[PDB]
Amino acid sequence: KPSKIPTPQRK
Amino acid sequence: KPSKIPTPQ
Amino acid sequence: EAAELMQQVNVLKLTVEDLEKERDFYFGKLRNIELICQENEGENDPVLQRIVDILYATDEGFVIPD
Amino acid sequence: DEAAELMQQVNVLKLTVEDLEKERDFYFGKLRNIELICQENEGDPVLQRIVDILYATDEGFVIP
């Protein structure tokens, strides 16, 4: 159910 | 052949 | 002076919003594809499996959500 | 003073623009690769729904 599409990491 | 994915402008 | 740099800020701020819009459009297409895929993980098609590989591929500065 | 801190905000915004374009390219790239697979397998209700997904248009977007 939760998305596993790569997102930008925090800095 | 080409792309047909919508794009801005 | 201030009016010139504020002009740049104003223009840049709207660019930021056009880009967010554009990113949200593409990212939503992928979330929908990822729904269609999760929703046919019973069919066992490797073609949809090829697509899940692509969805989950990372690059520089991009991580799996956790 | 004010011109120092607006130059600061301009700079910050330039980085945000770059970051968003990076993020956007990443997502567009995934969509092309997916479109690529689809335009090899023309001739099934699923992959045609995926193509229907890719090609959906909203205000501010044109199919090229």
Side-chain angles (χ1 to χ4, degrees):
Chain A
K1 187 168 277 169
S3 182
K4 278 318 183 92
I5 300 171
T7 54
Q9 57 199 36
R10 74 204 190 281
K11 321 181 202 85
Chain B
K1 297 156 161 57
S3 180
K4 286 153 200 184
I5 295 169
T7 323
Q9 291 205 351
Chain C
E1 70 279 28
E4 211 281 322
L5 292 160
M6 197 61 193
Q7 187 48 13
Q8 293 190 49
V9 176
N10 292 4
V11 164
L12 275 161
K13 287 200 80 194
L14 299 182
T15 300
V16 172
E17 302 288 313
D18 286 328
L19 285 167
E20 287 179 343
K21 187 164 88 76
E22 178 177 8
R23 181 213 54 207
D24 294 328
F25 183 62
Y26 298 146
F27 180 86
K29 286 187 184 310
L30 303 168
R31 274 286 290 125
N32 276 301
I33 294 172
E34 166 184 44
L35 298 165
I36 262 77
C37 286
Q38 285 158 344
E39 171 259 327
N40 298 271
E41 213 177 319
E43 304 179 335
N44 276 316
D45 194 23
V47 195
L48 275 83
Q49 176 53 55
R50 308 290 141 89
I51 289 165
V52 95
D53 300 315
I54 277 170
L55 278 173
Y56 300 149
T58 52
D59 211 304
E60 324 274 307
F62 294 101
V63 292
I64 298 290
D66 228 300
Chain D
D1 197 326
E2 272 212 2
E5 78 164 45
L6 288 161
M7 291 194 287
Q8 188 51 95
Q9 193 176 0
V10 169
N11 290 337
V12 168
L13 286 170
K14 275 155 140 75
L15 301 178
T16 325
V17 171
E18 191 182 18
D19 288 357
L20 286 166
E21 293 174 322
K22 280 156 161 30
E23 186 170 1
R24 175 220 44 196
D25 292 357
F26 186 68
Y27 301 142
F28 186 83
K30 291 168 166 295
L31 296 172
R32 268 288 289 165
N33 294 332
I34 297 168
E35 180 178 35
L36 250 31
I37 292 165
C38 292
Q39 62 200 29
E40 284 159 8
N41 296 234
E42 283 191 307
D44 168 39
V46 172
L47 270 76
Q48 64 195 45
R49 183 158 41 200
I50 283 180
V51 168
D52 275 354
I53 290 155
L54 305 175
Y55 296 159
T57 63
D58 200 13
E59 203 197 324
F61 295 96
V62 282
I63 167 183

